[PDB]
Design a binder for this molecule. Structure first.
Ligand SMILES: O=[N+]([O-])c1ccc(O[C@@H]2O[C@H](CO)[C@@H](O[C@@H]3O[C@H](CO)[C@@H](O)[C@H](O)[C@H]3O)[C@H](O)[C@H]2O)cc1
Ligand SMILES: O=[N+]([O-])c1ccc(O[C@@H]2O[C@H](CO)[C@@H](O[C@@H]3O[C@H](CO)[C@@H](O)[C@H](O)[C@H]3O)[C@H](O)[C@H]2O)cc1
Ligand SMILES: *[C@@H]1O[C@H](CO)[C@@H](O)[C@H](O)[C@H]1NC(C)=O
Ligand SMILES: [Co+2]
Ligand SMILES: [Co+2]
Length: 434
């Protein structure tokens, strides 16, 4: 797609800290950009929509190439349309925003310039952020994560994409998402099927795969840390059901692991660690700090800080594994005890290290789940299982929770706030900000 300018595009500014092994930190100034799927897509020469509701224009978009030629992405009114605001080092995303139309959530990328994404090399480094999840009930997910996207949003590889990172192009993740309207400089109208339960979305014949580090998927009830490897590290198109992921009938596709080696302290047995109020170690009614460290072995370490008190990731015992480091032994014990082979099939932490060794883009989002109601995060899943099934219970939410239309109606003013991002060598991000 190209870019149009009927609506101006001004990326909300966002600062973050780059910290040094020598003990200082230096402020960086970036901005955030909303993903292309949230934008108005219209004809290059008029205001006629190329996509509306969950249907493509059959005349403007008779095939993927003609559609991309005929159509452009336009600018975003971040606050008034999308409920996205920033202030200094803080980013807030509202759940439902009513303007001329209803918007639900957002997916945002951290930019280096107004036309390029910021890249981070995670291996050897740590990433810290503060989060307020107090206004995230059952069924919602405020996510902070990394994906192996191109810094230019795909422009250099696919010159029929001239919109680029400035307009939030080039997304990929371990779900190999097929809901994307543009992939590799072409539309995704071919094979498009509208969602039966979402007036604004559908699933196309192509998806966009790449490695994904889910630092944080969470609400006020549950949180999870999950690396996802793919057989090809970076962005790659996939065809139909070969994509696997949420958007295919068979979740286990050809290249990415859509489940990951997940670590949810509640799921692992510690039901007192994270939740609302003073009965939990971490009180989710209050802001907390989350630090994630990528040691060069390929293992992942985690600690939290709240009100000046520090907590390592809680210990877990699972099969022959015992500890709090997310390492090969944890991931293979998890597959043995909970079931499945997707993570190991796609090459495990060894394959995942190939992604963290290179650059990845920072993503922050807020979403509800039109496929499984977020039950995998915060409830019992599958819902016919009980506490006697290892790993079935992931949080205390009812198995009836998280119906999108219901939570959108009942909790439209839900929101997530991410703030105080700090990145640098392991051991550096707790030092004084600059
Ligand atoms: O009996 N089993 O073997 C079994 C295992 C797992 C089952 O549910 C799957 O659980 C995964 C881990 O919670 C889920 O993966 C998560 O999916 C999210 C949505 O796509 C994604 O954002 C997250 O990163 C990922 O870890 C998966 O969705 C469940 O199907 C069921 C039975
Ligand atoms: O030793 N510490 O590091 C430490 C940190 C935080 C502590 O308490 C928390 O302090 C927060 C900031 O003052 C409080 O949050 C603020 O509460 C206000 C009143 O409700 C509210 O208006 C504001 O928006 C909010 O940020 C929090 O309640 C405290 O628990 C203590 C020690
Ligand atoms: C949960 O984790 C916290 C922090 O490590 C710990 O103090 C507490 O004892 C744990 N509780 C259970 C039931 O494992
Ligand atoms: Co094709
Ligand atoms: Co280690």
């Amino acid at each position: 797609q190209s870019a149009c300018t009927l609506q101006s595009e001004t990326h909300p500014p966002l600062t973050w800290q780059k910290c040094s092994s020598g003990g200082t930190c230096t402020q960086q100034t970036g901005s955030v950009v909303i993903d292309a799927n949230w934008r108005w897509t219209h004809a290059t020469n008029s205001s006629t929509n190329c996509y509306d509701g969950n249907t493509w224009s059959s005349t403007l978009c008779p095939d993927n190439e003609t559609c991309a030629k005929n159509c452009c992405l336009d600018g975003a009114a971040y606050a008034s349309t999308y409920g996205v605001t920033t202030s200094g080092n803080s980013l807030s995303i509202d759940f439902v925003t009513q303007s001329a139309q209803k918007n639900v959530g957002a997916r945002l990328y951290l930019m280096a310039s107004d036309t390029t994404y910021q890249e981070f090399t995670l291996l050897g480094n740590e990433f810290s952020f503060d989060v307020d999840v107090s206004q995230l009930p059952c069924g919602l997910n405020g996510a902070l994560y990394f994906v192996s996207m191109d810094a230019d949003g795909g422009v250099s590889k696919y010159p029929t994409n001239t919109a680029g990172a400035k307009y939030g192009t080039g997304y990929c993740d371990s779900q190999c998402p097929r809901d994307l309207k543009f992939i590799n400089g072409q539309a995704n109208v071919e094979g498009w099927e509208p969602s039966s339960n979402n007036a604004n979305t559908g699933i196309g014949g192509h998806g966009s795969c790449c490695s994904q580090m889910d630092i944080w998927e969470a609400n006020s009830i549950s949180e999870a840390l999950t690396p996802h490897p793919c057989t090809t590290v970076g962005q790659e198109i996939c065809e139909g059901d070969g994509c696997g992921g949420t958007y295919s009938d068979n979740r286990y596709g050809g290249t990415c692991d859509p489940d990951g080696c997940d670590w949810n302290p509640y799921r692992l047995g510690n039901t007192s660690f994270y939740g609302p109020g003073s009965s939990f170690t971490l009180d989710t009614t209050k802001k907390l700090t989350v630090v994630t460290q990528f040691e060069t072995s390929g293992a992942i370490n985690r600690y939290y800080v709240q009100n000046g008190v520090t907590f390592q990731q809680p210990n877990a015992e699972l099969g022959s594994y015992s500890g709090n480091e997310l390492n090969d032994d944890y991931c293979t014990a998890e597959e043995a005890e909970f079931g499945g082979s997707s993570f190991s099939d796609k090459g495990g932490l060894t394959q995942f290290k190939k992604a963290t060794s290179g650059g990845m883009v920072l993503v922050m989002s807020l979403w509800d789940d039109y496929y499984a109601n977020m039950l995998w995060l915060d409830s019992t899943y599958p819902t016919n299982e009980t506490s006697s099934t290892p790993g079935a219970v992931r949080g205390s939410c009812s198995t009836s929770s998280g119906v999108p239309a219901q939570v959108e109606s009942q909790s439209p003013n839900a929101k997530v706030t991410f703030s105080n991002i700090k990145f640098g060598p392991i051991g550096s991000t707790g030092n004084p900000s600059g």
